[PDB]
Design a protein around this ligand. Structure first.
Ligand SMILES: OC[C@H]1O[C@@H](O[C@H]2[C@H](O)[C@@H](O)[C@H](O)O[C@@H]2CO)[C@H](O)[C@@H](O)[C@@H]1O
Length: 178
């Protein structure tokens, strides 16, 4: 079911492009980029509703271990389904429309070994237990991922400029300009 094949260094890729694994998550926290009012664990509603993600830790902080205002807070990633998935842990989505998600939170290694246990940032050939160099946990509090019918799809991933509405949202996060 995984369509991204490991390269000579173990990193799963699809027609050269790097792949990522995905999951859904819900937890109601403000999150590691400070996207809510300062000092309170209350996310702005948009950060529960939009296409936002908690990437695995080493991408979140560009190789570091900071779980507050990681270096990649506010970046956006375009995720494109390959049609693949990890057997027993996902399925094939109905279409392969790409979706852009903004980084507003972190998936720490601690307590997320299977998917987020990756010991180096992309570029360094470290992978999770399924062979991907990065993992994106996708916020699903209001069913925004369920609505895509994404059941942990395998994707190719790249950083892209954020759409204007997400850039404006990110400007009220506390980690904007740290
Ligand atoms: O919620 C504010 C709080 O977020 C912390 O990041 C957590 C996040 O809350 C949780 O949803 C996610 O799954 O894990 C990360 C990392 O544990 C952040 O680390 C705190 O500094 C921040 O105050």
């Amino acid at each position: 079911a995984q369509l991204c094949q490991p390269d000579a260094h173990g990193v799963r890729r699809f027609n050269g492009r790097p792949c990522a694994s995905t999951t859904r998550y819900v937890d109601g926290h403000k999150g590691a980029c400070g996207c809510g009012q300062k000092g309170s664990d209350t996310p702005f509603p948009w950060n529960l509703q939009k296409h936002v993600t908690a990437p695995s830790e080493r991408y979140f902080d560009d190789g570091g271990s900071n779980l507050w205002c990681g270096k990649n807070c506010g970046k956006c990633v375009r995720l494109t389904p390959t049609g693949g998935f990890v057997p027993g842990k996902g399925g094939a989505p109905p279409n392969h429309n790409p979706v852009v998600f903004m980084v507003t939170n972190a998936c720490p290694i601690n307590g997320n070994e299977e998917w987020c246990g990756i010991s180096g940032k992309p570029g360094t050939n470290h992978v999770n237990s399924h062979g991907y160099e990065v993992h994106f946990a996708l916020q699903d509090q209001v069913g925004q991922v369920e609505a895509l019918h994404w059941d942990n799809p395998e994707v190719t991933w790249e950083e892209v400029p954020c759409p204007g509405d997400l850039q404006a949202n990110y400007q009220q996060c506390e980690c904007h300009n740290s």
